[PDB]
Design a protein around this ligand. Structure first.
Ligand code: NAG
Lengths: 5, 230
């Protein structure tokens, strides 16, 4: 699953 | 040395794709004891995200290899020693960041945006620790992550718009935290859908570039919401 920085 | 120098060296480091340097620099700026600009706050965030992401992928690989049918007890021993070498590294990185969050960044946070941002970061680098934690030390880390995420969340609800990227960001990682760490799809899908529907409810009044970073994050929320429910 993808995410964000 | 001046922040200005460190920040430039950190930007140079980014383009050079040398993130150990980058983080070490952004760390030096944090330790000066002054609140970061939204630029300096995003350099640090990026720096350590890569510094850690390396060990994470390294760790995961050696964990998939150590899964394979290995005969040589030696080859099996070094596999563990190496996975553990990478863990201790993965751990130092997290502690160093969580140290910065606690000592300097979170307490110096002045704006609601910043506070929420650093609290999400705190949650992340506990979630990282919990991936390679063991015994009782695991339960502690898993819990601390949720505290940080949760604290961030109630600030974001009270101080920020549903479409605000930092809040959209928190929603994503926190929903993901539930899914991977606590192995709970319902909560994961629950948090994602809410963060998503609250967003489209007020996504027409915000337009163009405030709406670019927002949609992208809402993209990922939707990508997880589908995969998980199937
Ligand atoms: C990106 O997603 C991965 C997998 O869900 C997660 O491990 C990581 O924490 C995310 N990135 C950030 C900056 O949280």
């Amino acid at each position: 699953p993808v995410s964000q920085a | 040395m001046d922040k200005s120098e460190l920040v430039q060296k950190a930007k140079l480091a980014e383009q050079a794709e040398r993130y150990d340097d980058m983080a070490a620099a952004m760390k030096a700026v944090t330790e000066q004891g002054h609140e970061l600009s939204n630029e300096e706050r995003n350099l640090l965030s990026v720096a350590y995200k890569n510094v850690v992401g390396a060990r994470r992928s390294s760790w995961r690989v050696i964990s998939s290899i150590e899964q394979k049918t290995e005969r040589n007890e030696k080859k099996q021993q070094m596999g563990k020693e190496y996975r553990e070498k990478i863990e201790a590294e993965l751990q130092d990185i997290c502690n160093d960041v969580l140290e910065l969050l606690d000592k300097y960044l979170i307490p110096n946070a002045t704006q609601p945006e910043s506070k929420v941002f650093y609290l999400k970061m705190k949650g992340d680098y506990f979630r990282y620790l919990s991936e390679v934690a063991s015994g009782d030390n695991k339960q502690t880390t898993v819990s601390n992550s949720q505290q940080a995420y949760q604290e961030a969340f109630e600030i974001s609800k009270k101080e920020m718009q549903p479409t605000h990227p930092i809040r959209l960001g928190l929603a994503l990682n926190f929903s993901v935290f539930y899914y991977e760490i606590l192995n709970s799809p319902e909560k994961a899908c629950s948090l994602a859908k809410t963060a998503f529907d609250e967003a489209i409810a007020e996504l027409d009044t915000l337009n163009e570039e405030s709406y670019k970073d927002s949609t992208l994050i809402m993209q990922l929320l939707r990508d997880n919401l589908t995969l998980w429910t199937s």
